[PDB]
């Protein structure tokens, strides 16, 4: 017998209550990163190794560019909600 | 014995929600760059093993009846189930073309006890969407 | 650069 809410992961592209962030030319910034950490380690890496990956990539190497100065210069970093009873290997 | 079990005769499906456009009762402008993002999940997914479906500019019913449909279907020979969702959004809730779904409404389909051929197995939900308006203005 |  096991929990019916287990197995389940949530990669959400910010935290609670936060914006998330897209680029009309180059997509959203979750998106990006996520998809440049899988081409390069989406098959020898553990799901959260890759997700905290992410993470930093997100954190790092984007800031907004923007008209307003109420929306300029700012970050973002996703948020990982783990379930999962085992470790994922691709 | 750590891992989760990968032995099956495919990896999964995987769902990608690519929602650019939206009716102007809701008042949300168009996502540009989503088309970007949707066919860039597409190359990635698949590579990894995935057999992705992309859908484009869901209402809520037909999100709703995407995931239960997906839901519904036979597991057995499946290791794990993806699901990307993009679109516009607000704490807790999703934006579908004609309106909100909460985001727990349209994950509770793949319960253990609402999709025995995924129990045991990895549900995973990948979700590009405000969460709120707060702004993370950052620090060196 | 916009919000979601």
Same mark, same amino acid.
């Given at each position: 017998?096991?929990?019916?809410?287990?197995?389940?992961?949530?990669?959400?592209?910010?935290?609670?209550?936060?914006?998330?962030?897209?680029?009309?030319?180059?997509?959203?910034?979750?998106?990006?990163?996520?998809?440049?950490?899988?081409?390069?380690?989406?098959?020898?890496?553990?799901?959260?190794?890759?997700?905290?990956?992410?993470?930093?990539?997100?954190?790092?190497?984007?800031?907004?560019?923007?008209?307003?100065?109420?929306?300029?210069?700012?970050?973002?970093?996703?948020?990982?909600?783990?379930?999962?009873?085992?470790?994922?290997?691709? | 014995?750590?891992?989760?079990?990968?032995?099956?005769?495919?990896?999964?499906?995987?769902?990608?929600?690519?929602?650019?456009?939206?009716?102007?009762?809701?008042?949300?402008?168009?996502?540009?760059?989503?088309?970007?993002?949707?066919?860039?999940?597409?190359?990635?997914?698949?590579?990894?093993?995935?057999? +992705?479906?992309?859908?484009? *500019?869901?209402?809520?019913?037909?999100?709703? @009846?995407?995931? $239960?449909?997906?839901? =519904?279907?036979?597991?057995?020979?499946?290791?794990?189930?993806?699901?990307?969702?993009?679109?516009?959004?607000?704490?807790?809730?999703?934006?579908?073309?004609?309106? +909100?779904?909460?985001?727990? *409404?349209?994950?509770?389909?793949?319960?253990? @006890?609402?999709? $025995?051929?995924?129990? =045991?197995?990895?549900?995973?939900?990948?979700?590009?969407?405000?969460?709120?308006?707060?702004?993370?203005?950052?620090?060196? | 650069?916009?919000?979601?």
């Amino acid at each position: 017998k096991i929990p019916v809410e287990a197995d389940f992961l949530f990669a959400y592209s910010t935290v609670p209550g936060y914006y998330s962030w897209r680029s009309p030319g180059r997509g959203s910034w979750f998106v990006q990163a996520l998809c440049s950490i899988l081409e390069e380690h989406g098959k020898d890496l553990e799901i959260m190794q890759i997700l905290t990956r992410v993470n930093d990539r997100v954190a790092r190497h984007f800031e907004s560019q923007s008209d307003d100065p109420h929306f300029h210069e700012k970050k973002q970093i996703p948020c990982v909600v783990s379930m999962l009873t085992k470790e994922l290997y691709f | 014995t750590y891992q989760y079990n990968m032995n099956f005769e495919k990896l999964g499906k995987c769902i990608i929600i690519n929602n650019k456009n939206f009716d102007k009762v809701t008042g949300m402008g168009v996502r540009n760059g989503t088309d970007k993002d949707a066919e860039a999940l597409f190359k990635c997914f698949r590579s990894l093993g995935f057999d +992705v479906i992309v859908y484009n *500019d869901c209402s809520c019913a037909k999100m709703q @009846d995407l995931l $239960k449909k997906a839901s =519904e279907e036979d597991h057995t020979n499946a290791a794990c189930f993806a699901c990307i969702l993009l679109s516009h959004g607000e704490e807790n809730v999703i934006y579908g073309k004609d309106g +909100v779904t909460p985001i727990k *409404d349209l994950t509770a389909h793949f319960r253990g @006890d609402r999709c $025995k051929t995924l129990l =045991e197995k990895p549900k995973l939900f990948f979700i590009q969407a405000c969460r709120g308006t707060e702004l993370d203005d950052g620090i060196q | 650069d916009e919000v979601x």
